[PDB]
Each structure stands twice: as C-alpha cells, then as structure tokens.
C-alpha cells in the first residue's frame with residue numbers, strides 16, 4: 359500500500375544517511391527537500407545531508423528540492439529505473455542548486 | 467592539435483544544428499542560458515548555449531542560468547550518443563553550477 363511503500367523508502371534513506379561517516383570524505387553537503395508524490399497526497403521530507411538528519415516537514419530555503427512519484431522512487435531504489443533514465447523520462451523535478459543536485463546524482 | 471579542433475568543431479556544429487532545429491514557437495521548457503566549458507589539452511573551450519534566444523556563441527556569459535563543465539572525450543561521447551547525460555551525471559563526469567530546474571529540463575530534452 360502507499361503507507362508501507364512510503365515507510366520503506368524513508369527507512370532506506372534514513373539507513374543511507376545513518377551510514378555516512380561525518381568526518382570521512384563527503385561531497386554532498388546540504389539540505390534537500392524531498393516531495394514524494396503519492397496517489398493520495400504529497401509526503402514531505404527534509405533530508406539534511408549537512409547535519410545528517412531526516413525529518414518529516416517542509417524546510418525553509420532548502421538547497422535543492424526534489425519532487426518524484428512514489429513508484430518511481432521505489433524503482434530507483436530497487437534499481438529497475440536508473441537515475442539517468444528517470445531524468446530522460448522527466449520523472450524528477452528539481453529546483454535549487456544544480457551543483458548539489460549533480461553531486462547527489464553521483465552518490466545515489 | 468588538429469584532432470582537438472576537429473572534436474570541438476563537431477561538438478559545436480552538432481549543438482548548433484540541434485538549437486537551430488527548435489521551433490521557437492513550439493513546446494519548449496528549457497528557457498535558459500547555459501555556459502558550456504569543455505576542458506581540452508589546448509585550454510578550456512568556452513561556449514554560450516542560449517536556449518532562450520536559440521543562439522550559440524563562443525565566449526563567457528555574465529550570469530548564465532547553468533554552467534556546465536565537462537572533459538572533451540566525455541562531451542564528444544555525449545554529442546555522439548555514446549554516453550547519455552544521465553550516465554554522465556551518475557559517473558561524476560559533469561560539473562554543474564546554477565539552476566537545478568533548468569539542468570534537469572536540459573537532461574530530459576537532450
């Protein structure tokens with residue numbers, strides 16, 4: 359269902375952020391607003407890769423905002439849809455800093 | 467280096483053909499000026515790809531919407547459809563600064 363799917367994606371993001379060494383090599387420092395489009399609404403999450411924290415909400419002046427459908431997010435996570443292909447297909451909507459978005463693309 | 471020259475000319479001719487093929491009145495979502503810097507052993511090739519006015523000019527624009535910095539061999543491969551702009555980004559082969567919305571729009575339409 360939608361709830362379980364959203365929970366799955368968020369758990370996965372939290373485990374990825376949890377696994378970062380805050381003092382080790384790091385390229386993606388900034389705050390990402392993540393908007394997950396679901397059939398029932400938008401799920402809004404703040405992925406703070408500066409502070410290495412993930413909270414539900416809408417951040418004021420995030421560095422990058424990423425808007426993506428829930429099914430597309432699951433497909434990216436499961437590697438059945440590459441980020442390159444998502445981009446070609448216009449499945450990812452961005453605003454903000456192109457530098458930080460590009461760096462994020464390198465590490466996903 | 468004749469080979470660098472040939473490579474650069476081919477990239478630019480290709481971009482000019484593509485820009486010239488755009489219907490200024492048909493559907494368009496990439497309304498931005500892109501600074502394109504191509505690294506070469508002879509120096510950085512600096513080109514302005516103006517997708518607002520649909521013009522390509524050699525030079526450095528003041529305050530472009532997006533700046534794209536990329537190596538000659540990688541740009542050639544993007545140009546010849548041997549590397550997608552998406553594979554490129556995933557591989558760290560493209561340095562960007564500027565407007566992420568316009569960058570993403572470019573990635574979709576190219």
Ligand SMILES: CCCCCCCCCCCCCCCC(=O)O
Nearest residue numbers: 374375378384385386390392405424
């Ligand atoms: C905000 C759009 C989707 C967010 C993508 C999930 C983020 C998970 C974090 C993984 C990135 C790890 C990068 C840490 C090391 C580095 O900064 O180079």
Ligand SMILES: CCCCCCCCCCCCCCCC(=O)O
Nearest residue numbers: 370371374424434435459460462463
């Ligand atoms: C300039 C292009 C930017 C494109 C890169 C942003 C896309 C963000 C989507 C992230 C989805 C991955 C989250 C799941 C985490 C995981 O399973 O590892």
Ligand SMILES: CCCCCCCCCCCCCCCC(=O)O
Nearest residue numbers: 481484488493494495496497534575
């Ligand atoms: C890695 C970036 C490569 C830079 C080269 C840009 C390629 C030329 C751009 C052609 C885009 C055509 C889009 C016109 C219609 C539209 O705005 O949607």
